[PDB]
Amino acid sequence: HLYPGEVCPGMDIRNNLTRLHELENCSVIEGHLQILLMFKTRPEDFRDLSFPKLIMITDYLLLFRVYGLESLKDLFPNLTVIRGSRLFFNYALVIFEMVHLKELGLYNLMNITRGSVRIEKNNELCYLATIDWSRILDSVEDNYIVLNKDDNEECGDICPGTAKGKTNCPATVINGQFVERCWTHSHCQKVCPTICKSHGCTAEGLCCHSECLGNCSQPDDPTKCVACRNFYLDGRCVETCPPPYYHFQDWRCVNFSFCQDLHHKCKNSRRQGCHQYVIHNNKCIPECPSGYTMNSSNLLCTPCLGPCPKVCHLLEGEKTIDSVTSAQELRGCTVINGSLIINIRGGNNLAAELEANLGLIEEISGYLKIRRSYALVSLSFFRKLRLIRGETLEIGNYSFYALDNQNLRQLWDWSKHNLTITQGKLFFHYNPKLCLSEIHKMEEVSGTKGRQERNDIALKTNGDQASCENELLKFSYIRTSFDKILLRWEPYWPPDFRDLLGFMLFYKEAPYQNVTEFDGQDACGSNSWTVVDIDPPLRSNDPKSQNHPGWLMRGLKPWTQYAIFVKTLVTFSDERRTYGAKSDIIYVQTDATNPSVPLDPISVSNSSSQIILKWKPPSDPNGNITHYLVFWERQAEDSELFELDYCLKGLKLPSRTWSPPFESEDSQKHNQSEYEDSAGECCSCPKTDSQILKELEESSFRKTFEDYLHNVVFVPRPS
């Protein structure tokens, strides 16, 4: 306290030519004037700016994405001290991702006791070659002064001492000689010595009192300091704040009312940021990290045993997350009391991170507008997502909205999860490639009917590519082998004994025991799952058949679990009641069988009489294993080794571990006798060149033939 003028904190500048003309009284800046989103600032308007004078600068400086700025030399005259209190990338000054800073102020800097200066991307910038180097920077090694016009040996270092004015320019020593060091074209720098840089120096005498810094009225008094490196308060200085006053970066003490009760008053009626500012780490902060909860009545953050959750109240109760990092922003916040809109564009399967983060985000108390979920085809990958409240209702009085969304084909599964609906109606429409009874199960688990309308939700379309088969099937018999496995299931057919046209077997590699039900994008062969068709069975007699519906499958490696099932080739019609069925996903383990061949066989050893063999398995995790057959009895005493490689030949056998009698290479890689086992499905075409309908066109056609052949030969009389 006890300062003249307006002690003004900082504020940002954005998207305009100049907004410094308003400043006509601020003589002290405690904040840091930031520049943001200045993609089109021209230099000509910055040649003149307004600022009365300066006592000191408290916070760091960060300059970013500015096109103009031929002159920033009118803002901070009469400088006394500058330091980065807060540190963006640990540096006192950060010039990065901007252009053409021809001139700037800061022409009487005395000391920066913490934080170096980084300069980058300044095609125009001069007079940084004739300034004090070590007298101003506390950390000379972290100094990054580069990419300046004078630094390119192109800008003449015109400075005072030759033809400019006088601005209290003493001659300081950095290289033995008392140099008339400068900062810009028409200014000179006042710099304190390095000896007492932690105490401050003044023209009124020697180095100031130890509590002072930069400049002081008189030495040997904490009160006389205008700037104290120790805690300043009410005119005086002290090493530590009283418990009634919380600390501020070794420099100030402030009453608890400005941290605790300042922000608790406002929930949605104050434009300052109402985050319940607490005190931890001996400092006032908006909120503390995870593992540190709130326990006291005063709402001071205190540690809790291990990591602990965070209940976060965000500004406006709305946050549209548009990226995986946009969700990591709210990482640690286990419960969010507001809307979390998803409009995420781009990315490639990084949403596993969301399963770590959104898999903890349980509640979304606001309207749920979610779309553009490209990464997760299925919404069943969040282990905490149960509560959806309507405290904020969007247009239509709905608490949920996902309309005409693309790149999605599934939702959250209730086999290992659940969700509840609250506060009014809900709208779900136009997300094709997904069955509709799953939404009915969603309504059933949610409960509280009347607010679950069967006319405001899709029950009319968006499911004519994944038929909802009411019935389900099993595997009555499964006779397996290393790959050849005959699966035989129930002979149940539809009421019509020709509408069913085979069975669509679905399978994939899945050692895990948790899988959803989906199908990746289509590129004529490429798909996350694998699917194939099986011919329909044959009728034998009315009461029962002597040949069950069976199918022999190959390609599956032994020892391996596959999340396999089947569906029925159903002819599309206007009623799904009489469709077929689908088996449940079984993680069927192909039996541990002799074609198990480990890979990456590495022979290592800690000695010559030892070989600590190690490997990796292709698909055999050794769960059912009992022992390993391994050979060390001599089986390389071969006549090929005893009768080969005369020294007259070139050195080729040395540095080898492969010799003729141990060879099992194929005679020819071409498919001749038994290499035809790799004969697989079409991968230029999915299965066949003609897509599915041309087959159905035939199938139903035969029916409309046969029935047409029947309807003429029967019904002799109505009576």
Binding site: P495, D496, E706, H710, P716, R717
Partner: peptide
């Protein structure tokens, strides 16, 4: 027939077995 829903050649065969020979009629006078 047996499930009350039969549709195919099995329907015709079962129908023929139900009546037997001299089982089908028709009406020329129409």
């Amino acid at each position: 027939f047996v499930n009350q829903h039969l549709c195919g050649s099995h329907l015709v065969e079962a129908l023929y077995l139900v009546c037997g020979e001299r089982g089908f009629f028709y009406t020329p006078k129409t």
